[PDB]
C-alpha cells in the first residue's frame, strides 16, 4: 500500500508514535517519506548480507528473523515479512524497541541526514488529525 501524506500521519498517531521517547509525529512522517515514499512494500539489501524491510526499513542483523543472516539475533521475536503489511502494527512495535536501545532515532541513518533539525511540522500541515 501507498499511503497519502495526511493518511499515514493519522495511522502513526493511532498506534502511539506521536512523541514516543520524545519524538514528534512529523519526525516519523519525514522518516517514512525518505525511507520508503510512503510505500509499505519497500525493501533494500545491505552489504553485510542483512536486509531492510517496510515503511521504516528495519534490519535483520539484530531485530527480525529472515533465515538468511548468519550469527544474527531476533530481538523483536518476529519474521521480517511482517514489516511489509498494509497494516503498520509490527513495524511500529519493533521501532519502539529499537528507539529504546541507547541511541534514539539516530538508529535510522536517513532520519539523522534528511529530517533531524528541519521544519518537520510541514509534513502534517493541512491534515485533519
Write out the residues near Na ion by the rule CB under 5 A. Answer: 60, 65, 69, 72, 74
Give the nearest distance from C-beta 64 to Cl ion in angstroms. Answer: 8
Q: Known binder of ligand: residue 119?
A: no
Beta carbons within 10 angstroms of residue 94's beta carbon: 23
Stretch that binds Cl ion, among 39-47, 48-56, 67-75, 107-115 (CB under 5 A): 67-75
Whether the CB-CB separation of 56 and 91 falls below 8 Å is answered with: yes
Grid coordinates 529530517 are at which residue? 115
Residues 31 and 49: their CA atoms lie apart, in Å, by: 23
Q: Would you count residue 46 as binding Cl ion (CB under 5 A)?
A: no
Phi, psi of 23 (to 5 degrees): -105, 115
Q: Would you count residue 125 as binding Cl ion (CB under 5 A)?
A: no
Give the nearest distance from C-beta 26 to Cl ion in angstroms. Answer: 3
Whether the CB-CB separation of 53 and 83 falls below 8 Å is answered with: yes
Nearer to Na ion, 45 or 128 (CB): 45
Q: Which residues are catalytically annotated? A: 35, 52
Amino acid at each position: 500500500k501507498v499511503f497519502g501524506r495526511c493518511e499515514l500521519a493519522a495511522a502513526m498517531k493511532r498506534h502511539g508514535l506521536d512523541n514516543y521517547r520524545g519524538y514528534s509525529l512529523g519526525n516519523w512522517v519525514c522518516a517514512a517519506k525518505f525511507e520508503s515514499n510512503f510505500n509499505t512494500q519497500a525493501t533494500n539489501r545491505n552489504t553485510d548480507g542483512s536486509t531492510d524491510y517496510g515503511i521504516l526499513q528495519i534490519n535483520s542483523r539484530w531485530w527480525c528473523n529472515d533465515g538468511r543472516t548468519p550469527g544474527s539475533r531476533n530481538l523483536c521475536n518476529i519474521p521480517c515479512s511482517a514489516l511489509l503489511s498494509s497494516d503498520i502494527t509490527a513495524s511500529v512495535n519493533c521501532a519502539k524497541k529499537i528507539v529504546s536501545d541507547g541511541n534514539g532515532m539516530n538508529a535510522w541513518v536517513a532520519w539523522r541526514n534528511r529530517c533531524k533539525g528541519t521544519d518537520v511540522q510541514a509534513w502534517i500541515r493541512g491534515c485533519r488529525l
